[PDB]
């Protein structure tokens, strides 16, 4: 599963 804190500038929502 992806780490949302790898790049905080990325919101994972579709």
């Amino acid at each position, epitope marked *: 599963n992806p780490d949302p804190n790898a790049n*905080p500038n990325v*919101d994972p929502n579709a």
Partner: antibody
Amino acid sequence: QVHLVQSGAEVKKPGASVKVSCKASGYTFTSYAIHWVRQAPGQRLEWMGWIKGGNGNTRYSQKFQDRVTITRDTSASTAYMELSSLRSEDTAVYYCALLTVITPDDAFDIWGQGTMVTVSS
Amino acid sequence: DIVMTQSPDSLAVSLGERATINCKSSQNILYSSNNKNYLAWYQQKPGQPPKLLFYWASTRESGVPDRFSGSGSGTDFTLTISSLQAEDVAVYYCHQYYSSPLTFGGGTKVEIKR
């Protein structure tokens, strides 16, 4: 219109330290995290770290965890990256960047102009 | 440590023709939960900072000409320049933002042949 303006190029002695600055404008500085990414001549981009412009939490690459410090001044809207114990492979262009900002509303990606750092006596 | 491996290291393609750049990731960067591929394609001209071309593997960046296309999923990704012109000659990086540390491929130098 969102701008990342980095400090000027530098020559540093081996084992010394270097602080590169990144002045951010055009956006709410507290909203996003600024990344530091370096590129030795002709080599691939090496991601160094990021710091949230308002919060202040940092995440470093494990390769630079020992020698790197990312800091921020929320008033001056400036991120700083300090690399210490400068070795030979540290000679590179050091970019700050708003790497792949993918908000629920927008998507963009902005870099500074880069800062050459040559580690030489 | 998601290793990003590009192929070939340098491509020599002629005007109007297709350029193909493969990028393989050492681990699957497709999240099943949202069906998104955590991969970006960056464009870099010499002396300039890299320019985002694609994110979510294939979602176009605003401004990138439609001759640029992103294909692929999971661990295998491809950047296709269906009709090459001089302003596309650059070095092409894949990049994963799936996990930390963020990593880039070794880059593919897109050269122009006569």
